[PDB]
């Protein structure tokens, strides 16, 4: 229905410029204010600004005025957030969101609905690195009570994020994709596990689908019982 | 700017309990307060707009009230899927501001972890490194202790762990711990063991394997 689609991840070096995008569909893009919000560490959200795509009128938070530029191309129903010169501390999840409004006599009150999925922007001097993906094979040591655990270990990547699905999204019950840890090297690792019937290990196929957009890495790893 | 302060900052409650979160604004914002739910790793979702209007498709257990400077979000009968961070937001005055967020967690009965262990894959060994993984599945409460033992010697300094967010269906946690060694070191020892201590367990559970077999 109403949807805002942004990229899930962008990685740049300090001093580089960046423009991220948010494409609206399922509504008349020119008729709604649309804006950007920054995710704060742990908890918290900071509104950055809004634009009216009908005429490109903008309003910024005082915290973000002059640090970013918001723009829009109504031809392709797309809004943008841009930095001229990135800092490492600009790293964050950024959301675009539509702002429905209620007005009387030209005075408007606004909220955010709906929100895009969020774009994780990482600014770092460190090298981008694709993950190695290893099977966590089900075995006599990961089977108990009729349940088998199996998984994938996604090791030595930078930066976040990695996405993991199982069987191209058909397998979701019992999946735990863990928060990544930061290794001593400054690389990330994570594991994704699933619990399934021990009885059908012989007949079912389990494939973890790992995507690391920053390195354009896609791995499909078939996880077979230990033999 | 208008500062929004949510109370409390964290709440823990049982399935079926009434939960109430308040938002106090530094100045009057009339009725122009919205409430959002945000799950870990996901975008916020609107629950309530204009103080008391329920968003379409949002369960009726959610309700908002208030005007001026004192607003309330109420969940009448808490469900496991309500685990989230909740935010209020004023849209009356520039700049638009959000509250600091309230974390809502579910209290439930104790659940012991199911413990599983995974040797390194042959594929990883080819690359010169050996990661052994210990999984603690679906336990409550979150506090758990994992110890690694190699040939019965307690390890320090060579593992990392992480815990999941609370599960949206059963309100449990899971934990993954990885022991990482060089292939050379891995090949010099036989018995690899994960030892798990948790409230749900009478005595510590050890899961182990021999590299030999």
């Amino acid at each position: 229905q109403v949807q805002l689609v942004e990229s899930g991840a962008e990685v740049k070096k300090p001093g580089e410029s960046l423009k991220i995008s948010c494409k609206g569909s399922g509504y008349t893009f020119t008729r709604y204010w649309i804006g950007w919000v920054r995710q704060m560490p742990g908890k918290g959200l900071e509104w950055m600004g809004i634009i009216y795509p009908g005429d490109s009128d903008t309003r910024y938070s005082p915290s973000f005025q002059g640090h970013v530029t918001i723009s829009a191309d109504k031809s392709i129903s797309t809004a943008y957030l841009q930095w001229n010169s990135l800092k490492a501390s600009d790293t964050a999840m950024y959301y675009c969101a539509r702002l429905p409004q209620y007005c009387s006599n030209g005075v408007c009150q606004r909220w955010f609905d709906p929100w895009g999925q969020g774009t994780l922007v990482t600014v770092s001097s460190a090298s981008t690195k694709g993950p190695s993906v290893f099977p966590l094979a089900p075995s006599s040591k990961s089977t108990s009570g009729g349940t088998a655990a199996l998984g994938c270990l996604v090791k030595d990547y930078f930066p976040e994020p990695v996405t993991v699905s199982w069987n191209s999204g058909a397998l979701t019950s019992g999946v735990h994709t863990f928060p990544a840890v930061l290794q001593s090297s400054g690389l990330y690792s994570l594991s994704s596990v699933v619990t399934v019937p021990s009885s059908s290990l012989g007949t079912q196929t389990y494939i973890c689908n790992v995507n690391h957009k920053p390195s354009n890495t896609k791995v499909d790893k078939k996880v077979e019982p230990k033999s | 700017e208008i500062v929004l302060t949510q109370s409390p900052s964290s709440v823990s409650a049982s399935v079926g309990d009434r939960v109430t979160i308040t938002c106090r604004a530094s100045q009057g914002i009339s009725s122009w307060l919205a409430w959002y739910q945000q799950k870990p790793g996901k975008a916020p979702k609107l629950l309530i707009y204009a103080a008391s209007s329920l968003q379409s498709g949002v369960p009726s257990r959610f309700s908002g009230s208030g005007s001026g400077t004192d607003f309330t979000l109420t969940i009448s009968s808490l469900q496991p899927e309500d685990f989230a961070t909740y935010y209020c937001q004023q849209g009356n005055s520039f700049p638009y501001t959000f509250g600091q967020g309230t974390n809502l967690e579910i209290k439930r009965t104790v659940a012991a972890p199911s413990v599983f262990i995974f040797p390194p894959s042959d594929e990883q060994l080819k690359s010169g490194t050996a990661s052994v993984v210990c999984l603690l599945n679906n336990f409550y409460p979150r506090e758990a202790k994992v110890q690694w033992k190699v040939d019965n010697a307690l390890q320090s300094g060579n593992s990392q762990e992480s815990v999941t967010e609370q599960d949206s269906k059963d309100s449990t946690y899971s934990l993954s711990s990885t022991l990482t060694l060089s292939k050379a070191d891995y090949e010099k020892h036989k018995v690899y063991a994960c030892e798990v201590t948790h409230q749900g367990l009478s005595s510590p559970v050890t899961k182990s394997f021999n590299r030999g077999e």
Binding site: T28, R31, Y32, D55, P100, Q101, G106 | -
Partner: peptide, 15 residues
């Protein structure tokens, strides 16, 4: 209408 909706209640808004 681009101009109208810049400062009138949005099309999907009711209450």
């Amino acid at each position: 209408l681009d101009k109208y909706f810049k400062n009138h209640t949005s099309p999907d808004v009711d209450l």
